[PDB]
Design a protein around this ligand. Structure first.
Ligand SMILES: [Ca+2]
Ligand SMILES: [Ca+2]
Ligand SMILES: [Ca+2]
Ligand SMILES: [Ca+2]
Lengths: 686, 686
């Protein structure tokens, strides 16, 4: 199938995502509305249910509101049954309208609809070439107090109607009982509770296989993507085994949320995007875009430095989901803010690298502060606002122009208030110019681009005061004045002759799984795919066409590989690196070591004989291990995804800067479980 | 040995070349000075001999003039015996002071010195870590008139004293007798005479073998590079077999001259640098730098465009020889012009990509218009000019900082008078900021860089009004003012842990010859070099160390290959592409096809069964063939380098853009000569 079909569940850079808070979009079925104190039909108390549901989304796909905008993916609230309690916090009544307070991960929330309504949503979205991403929040169930079992539903967890357990009298230890986080430490934020939400214990084997069984059910119902909540607050080792479960089963595009504040650049965040198996909501993009286009706290050089810097820091930049606001932020549009700011920031996001997500109601210029004020019911389904029109004009270009979908980003002209950049993939190019100064025109002189000679019409049709670009010989453009607030988009597409890989999905799986490689210039005839120097041809290539090949991962040793495609004539593509071949299916084992005394700046690490443990290399060793909440120093512990059903060999080590201290003695050995979890508890061998 | 060694004859990116017109530099021995009408000791007549010689260059290496400047390579006039005539040209006497009127390519020009003075120069140069490049002008011999055998020495050619022939009564056709070129076409400028110079006929086997034996004896005398003259005026097919002779014998850095005018970009120019086996004097760079830094006919956005554009148009941009003037241009410094322009431009060339060449006397602010005026005698050997100090401070950076010698180039801040660019290679960085406005300061706000946080002295020590850089978090620099005419250079070096390939020389050779791969992070233990998927290891790696590996080309099919290095631990480098492995030793064959009538822009091409002929791919066929000068349409002809001593199968084809019309019949066959040339004259087969 082409890279652009709705059947491509693995990669979304040709898509534009519309993020829907289901309750606040459209009430298509009033009979499923909550009653009593849980409901507010006027939606003036934004913490109660307003009545929006899956029938309401179906109605707006059908009548052309969503498809007229060029949206090709919908991202909806978590679909799982939530608690029914109306919780009064400080006088304010609160409900699970948002879908984050789960009680049964195997049933739907009846206010949004029945399992048949969910199937109908999948089927009419797909019939309209719209992909469906669901939230999934496996960190916790719902508000609970172990001291007061009468509060809310005591965080109880059910399994398709069957009670597994509650927070008070938790003898199975389905939950963590360490108190609440003060967010001081990543370890602290993982094993202690977020606010009052009952924290699931992923080291309990029943919780581990339940969550993994529940996600396969939703994959079986046909979802196309997963947004997982609170990625910074679950064990990274357990999340990599959860990603291995979905990738070795039915790989779909998965991304997480790790919040980043205004000038925060976090190494851990980048590491997570690069090694977890999932990508991330690009907060670095969103915060710098708001500084330059909304708040005016940085200028175009900051924007340039973020575009340039993030193409290198994210190993797979085309998998990051970009945005300019979402339910975790004040809406971009303010009351005293010029609407042209929002229209330019949406044109910047729609033509930039990654996977663009538009928060519902942006095209109707909704404003509002933080939660819950950024979640009002959307006020109009007007199809004639300028903002609706810029998305309608730009969002189809991600399917039609591979430079917008996959291309590199190159700044061609800049000053404090103007950036014009070029996106390029093979022979396909898009050029966009934006003047964020609403008062001053900009004189553009000396612009050169990769466009062939011609008179390019602005894809936005002058609605954001863009103009035609006249390109002469050698990509040189005739000089022009960019209007105050001006934004124009110019483009050119042709066939690629060379194989060029634009995106690969999934990026981590065991031998035998089918991977999807997307690009241009692969040719009609089946060629060769290289994982390192291993060539796979013939029957292992399950599908081959010009924009997409689907191929089975060969039986190579675990580790990370470069991928390269050679068309049938022997011409090879660019390298797409950092693919991780797993040793096999994964399980997460807690490693605990006692009496591992350390100096200031010295920490304990784990390494062993399988790629998942870094293949005996101290620079790739697992850790630093934790030592405050579940166990305390000199006991250190860590949850690690490791191959299932195998005897691994391993050793602990201490690292202080360049100095490695291996424990003495024979290598340790352990036979991992085939499913569930396990704990190894050992003592430092001098 | 390390990449920066004087023994690295293959790659010169770490070097600074000083271009010397031997006769206009230093007369170290007056006894070899020409007498009478041929000589002018005051050097006021710039067309006569002034006395400069090889002994004088030895004196300036020994008294510390050249070595104090930091120069590491010297490029001198053609060393070959020239004609002795004083030629008149409208009452203006002219001599061969410039070395361009060769008589015998196996002897020295005695005004420059003896074979023993030449060996002494090589040895004094190498003792003081200076490489020696010679001009080589194989296109012609000297001024000749076939009508008047008494003019000049009638272009006579000798072979080590034995007369081979002259231009009048050239019974063995040593020369072209087609009349003179009007430069209308590439073909016209190749086979007709340039001005009045007797044009050598490289299709003659005696001329062909003579020139290739002549170059090999200069390589045997120890020369480290070759600049070949009039590269646009000799057959590409003959020049490629010449390059293969050098590269399959004793590969040294060789580059040619193909003149480009202001704003002239020639695709045949780029094709030649990318496919001939030699690189080129970077006229594209030189012309744009003069427009920005001297003449003010473009600004910093044009410089940016040249810099970004040429990085993709030259397949190996690190092999191009950059400069701001030379013997074919008016001198950069203008009489009573601002010296700061010349010092700025020198600093720009010295820190940009490629191999920088400084024309002698630039550091003494020599001014002069076109030939002979751009070659007066150097007026001073002063070591304290600001221009001498700029070269002295910046030339060593190409040896010490690999970001200067091999790095990528990236604009970080720009407006029409200021550019600040970064060079980057691994974690080594250099950033240089140039304000070309001599009267206005510039406030640099928003400079983001890859420098580690810290303060950085200007390496020029403030001589061109530079300043200290304070880099804070994330490479963001504190606001500062760039003075009028301010140029500052700031750098950071650290050792590289992963292998990075910065340059490969030679780029075209048969199996079995040793190539030199230069870069950083290779490690001290042998690893692997891949030519495609063919891993070369062990005894085939002649030498390995962290900055340089020497390895023998494996016995792979002729074609072009990607090179990659994997160090002893398996971390692989970047790909260095476009390496050509030849099928074997090369001979030039002239292919002639008669009765090949074509349509509106339909042309005749050649392809066949060896890589040198495109391996039967019509998109890679040799041509369009020629049909004006040596043979006339519908007879077409071309001179093609092909593997020597083997049977080739070939066929002609016509291409109407995308339509290929092939000859009918069976494939043609020819067994190529082992040396010398051959001619295949055939008729079109339907
Ligand atoms: Ca409803
Ligand atoms: Ca948690
Ligand atoms: Ca002399
Ligand atoms: Ca010629």
């Amino acid at each position: 199938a082409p890279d652009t079909s709705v059947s491509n569940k693995q990669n979304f850079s040709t898509d534009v995502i519309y993020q829907i808070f289901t309750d606040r979009f459209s009430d298509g079925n009033p009979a499923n509305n909550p009653t009593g104190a849980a409901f507010d039909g006027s939606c003036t108390n934004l913490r109660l249910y307003c009545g929006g549901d899956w029938q309401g989304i179906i109605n707006k796909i059908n009548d052309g509101y969503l498809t007229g905008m060029g949206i090709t993916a919908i991202w909806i609230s978590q679909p799982v049954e939530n608690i029914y309690s109306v919780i009064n916090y400080s006088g304010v009544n609160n409900t699970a309208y948002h879908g984050y307070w789960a009680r049964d991960f195997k049933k739907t929330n009846p206010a949004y609809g029945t399992m048949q309504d969910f199937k109908n949503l999948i089927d009419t979205a797909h019939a309209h070439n719209i992909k469906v991403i669901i939230d999934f929040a496996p960190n916790h169930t719902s508000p609970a107090s172990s001291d007061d079992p009468s509060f809310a539903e005591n965080g109880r967890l059910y399994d398709n109607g069957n009670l597994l357990g509650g927070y008070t009298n938790d003898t199975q230890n389905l939950f963590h009982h360490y108190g609440g986080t003060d967010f001081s430490t990543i370890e602290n934020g993982i094993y202690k509770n977020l606010y009052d939400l009952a924290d699931l214990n992923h080291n309990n084997s029943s919780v581990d296989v339940y969550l993994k069984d529940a996600i396969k059910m939703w994959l079986d119902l046909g979802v196309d993507g997963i947004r997982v909540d609170a990625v910074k607050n679950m064990p990274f080792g357990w999340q990599k085994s959860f990603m291995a479960t979905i990738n070795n089963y039915k790989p779909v595009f998965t991304f997480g949320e790790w919040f980043l504040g205004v000038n925060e650049i976090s190494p851990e965040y980048h590491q997570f995007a690069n090694e977890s198996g999932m990508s991330l909501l690009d907060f670095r993009f969103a915060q710098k875009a708001r500084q330059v286009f909304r708040d005016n706290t940085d200028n175009m050089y900051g924007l340039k430095a973020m575009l340039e810097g993030s193409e290198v820091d994210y190993a797979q930049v085309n998998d990051q989901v970009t945005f300019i606001d979402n339910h975790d932020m004040e809406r971009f549009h303010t009351s005293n803010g010029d609407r042209r700011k929002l229209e330019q920031a949406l044109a910047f996001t729609l033509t930039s690298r990654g996977v663009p997500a538009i928060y519902y109601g942006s095209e109707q210029y909704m404003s509002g502060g933080n939660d819950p004020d950024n979640r009002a019911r959307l006020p109009s389904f007007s199809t004639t606002t300028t903002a609706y029109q810029v998305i309608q004009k730009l969002a189809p270009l991600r399917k039609s122009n591979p430079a917008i979908a996959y291309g590199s980003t190159h700044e061609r002209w800049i000053n404090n208030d103007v950036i014009i950049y070029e996106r390029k993939f093979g022979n396909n190019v898009a050029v966009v110019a934006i003047n964020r100064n609403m008062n001053t025109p900009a004189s553009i002189t000396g612009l050169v681009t990769s466009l062939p000679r011609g008179s390019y019409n602005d894809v936005l049709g002058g609605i954001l005061n863009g103009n035609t670009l006249t390109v002469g010989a050698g990509g040189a453009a005739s000089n022009f004045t960019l209007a105050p607030g001006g934004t124009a988009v110019w483009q050119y597409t042709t066939d690629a002759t060379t194989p060029i890989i634009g995106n690969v999905g999934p990026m981590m799986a065991k031998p035998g799984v089918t991977i999807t490689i997307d690009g241009r210039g692969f040719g009609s005839g089946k060629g060769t795919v290289y994982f390192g120097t291993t060539a796979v041809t013939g029957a292992d290539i399950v599908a081959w066409e010009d924009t997409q090949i689907q191929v089975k991962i060969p039986a190579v040793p675990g580790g990370i590989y470069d991928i390269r495609v050679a068309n049938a004539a022997g011409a090879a593509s660019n390298i797409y690196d950092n693919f991780e071949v797993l040793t096999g299916d994964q399980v997460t084992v807690r490693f605990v070591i006692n009496n591992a005394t350390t100096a200031l700046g010295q920490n304990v690490f784990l390494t062993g004989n399988v790629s998942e443990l870094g293949n005996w290399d101290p620079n790739n060793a697992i850790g630093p291990m934790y030592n405050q909440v579940v166990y305390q120093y000199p006991t250190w512990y860590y949850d690690v995804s490791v191959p299932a059903g195998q005897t691994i060999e391993f050793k602990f080590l201490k690292k202080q800067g360049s100095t490695v201290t291996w424990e003495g003695g024979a290598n340790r050995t352990f036979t991992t479980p085939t499913s569930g979890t396990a704990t190894v508890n050992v003592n430092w061998q001098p």
